[PDB]
Design a protein around this ligand. Structure first.
Ligand code: ELX
Ligand code: ELX
Lengths: 347, 347
């Protein structure tokens, strides 16, 4: 059974999760260095250099599936490395071709489809020589998921989340003036299936990978039901994924204002509405998490997400953002403790 | 309104205590570089390089005296720097002259005696040109303690603990064959005023500086009575200071065996008696700490100190020492958590 008390949970993270994540992550970093195309190589290494925390955090789900610990972490790390690599490729495109963005994000759907034939995902861009990097990441996922006893029960839900994630990455990276019309028209197709929210709130809800890792985790269990697959998806989507990305965008505000970059928080009528809706998402997130198996573990993952995000220098070294962050959610001073602990370690 | 819950306590330590200690400690490092005598300079800088954790730990007492935070920490740092410097000078003496050891440790008594004229503390050794390093550490303590409204009420108790500490440093640093005879004669002078214990248990009890820092902390209060000053002294001496040094000796066993260093645990008739007496010290220490003002603070700091000691790789990587440590004190998974956290940071 998973640790649900802080001390054993933290001990298992430092002893088991982080060394196991880094065993595989550090192997991908060595592979990325051998990418022949200098632009693909740079984007791969930048994602690996800057976004380690995504894999370190995602790997914590390993604790729910000890019998498949190494394999589940290898899947989460391969899938998350792909997301961060592809995000860099889309963010750094000089061409802004949505066919390219889509073709790249179809790699994530291949990763979730064992025996899906691998295509040239780079077919709509000039840079295509990755020495098999992307194919190796896809095949890693394919070969692991197929060994999970209830993968077939969760696969449809994983693909639904991955498709929504890919759609977001396509629409938000096109030429500035075409982004919001695409996102609004895209939201309009899903809004009937969704709780009452805005196009930009929906956009945030689709931008997380947490639901995919949670479904992959429970895929390791014998006799998972279609009913439970659906409970597990609904536990994270839309509310938890929403809070995750609303925080990501909260922390990235000052660089988005300065770099004229798409930030979903900027489409709220005012700050009062933003804080009120954020608090609503948090309450709905707490309610959705409580429906899950191992609810106490999920509530710990979730508190950890909020705390680590709000501990960012961008929040804690900005008097205004720090004040507004405590208005959004009170965390018993954990964000500040993590900032000052971090600040002490690296000096 | 002193922080006692783990998150706010830890946040204050990382935000307030450690950065403030680091600032004053760094200023002492730069001051030490100006020591003219090459050997005194080498010993001052070595103590400062190796023993910063003593000041980091001692400074946590600042949180009991928020009004006097910076001044109390400057006192604690100056006193502890002096202790670790003098320890080095006595350790690395080629002549092992107890007159030298005594004269050096008389600096600690001067530090606790404002308006006292100072001697040449180096008067019994070859190396004497420190450019005022030791005088400035003394004067730093003297100038801070006079500003504490209740210093006069705790001064006698502080001088008592400082005298016994000085006595221990004198007796333990002489030639190997004179150490135990000196330590037994010394204990025999104090035996009748102490709870029942061995000369080597007594030696352990006198070797900590916690009592001095705690007394200095409550010196910052208006209208401390003699009764209260005696309660505060008894809260740390002898049981808490005893646990502190017995635990230090416990962890360093393998080191002290192979470097043939003096270790007071080796004078127990066997391991079983050593563990039995340690458990007794722990109980008396818990009892004496519970008599203090802010008893949850004192309990939390003491458990933190124990957890940090037991997290040492010397304990956690040594199956035998790990078994004995878990007999000696029940800390649950905290030492193991701190071990794996440290292992991760410094991989
Ligand atoms: C009891 C405690 C403190 C538990 C710690 C819980 C932690 C560290 C959770 C990390 C949160 C997490 C899963 C982050 C992953 C980030 C991710 C997948 C980002 C993709 O954009
Ligand atoms: C919260 C942190 C990182 C504290 C660091 C400080 C450490 C490691 C302290 C452990 C030792 C300690 C509390 C010593 C007290 C000072 C003293 C009298 C030392 C002489 O043995």
């Amino acid at each position: 059974k998973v640790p649900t008390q802080p001390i054993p949970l933290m001990m298992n993270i430092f002893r088991d999760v982080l060394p196991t994540v880094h065993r595989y992550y550090d192997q991908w970093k060595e592979r990325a260095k051998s990418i022949p195309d200098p632009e693909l190589r740079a984007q791969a290494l930048d994602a690996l250099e800057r976004k380690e925390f995504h894999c370190e955090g995602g790997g914590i789900y390993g604790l729910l599936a000890r019998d498949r610990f190494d394999e589940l972490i290898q899947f989460i790390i391969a899938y998350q490395i792909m997301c961060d690599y592809l995000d860099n490729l889309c963010d750094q495109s000089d061409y802004l071709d949505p066919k390219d963005f889509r073709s790249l994000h179809n790699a994530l759907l291949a990763a979730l489809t064992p025996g899906e034939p691998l295509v040239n995902y780079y077919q709509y861009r000039i840079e295509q020589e990755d020495g098999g990097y992307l194919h190796e990441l896809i095949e890693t996922c394919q070969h692991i998921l197929v060994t999970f006893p209830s993968f077939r029960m969760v696969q449809e839900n994983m693909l639904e989340l991955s498709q929504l994630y890919g759609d977001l990455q396509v629409h938000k990276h096109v030429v500035k003036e075409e982004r919001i019309p695409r996102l609004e028209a895209w939201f309009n197709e899903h809004k009937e299936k969704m709780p009452e929210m805005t196009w930009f709130e929906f956009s945030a809800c689709t931008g997380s990978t947490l639901g995919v890792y949670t479904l992959a985790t429970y895929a390791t269990k014998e006799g998972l039901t279609s009913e439970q697959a659906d409970v597990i998806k609904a536990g994270y989507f839309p509310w938890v994924q929403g809070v995750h990305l609303l925080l990501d965008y909260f922390i990235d505000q000052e660089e988005d204002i300065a770099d004229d970059e798409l930030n979903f928080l900027f489409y709220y009528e005012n700050e009062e509405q933003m804080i009120e809706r954020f608090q609503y998402f948090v309450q709905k997130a707490e309610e959705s998490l409580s429906t899950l198996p191992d609810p106490k573990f999920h509530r710990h993952i979730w508190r950890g997400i909020i705390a680590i995000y709000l501990s960012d220098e961008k929040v804690q070294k900005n008097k205004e953002l720090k004040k507004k962050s405590k208005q959004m959610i009170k965390m018993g001073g954990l964000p500040s403790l993590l900032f000052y602990l971090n600040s002490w370690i690296y000096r």
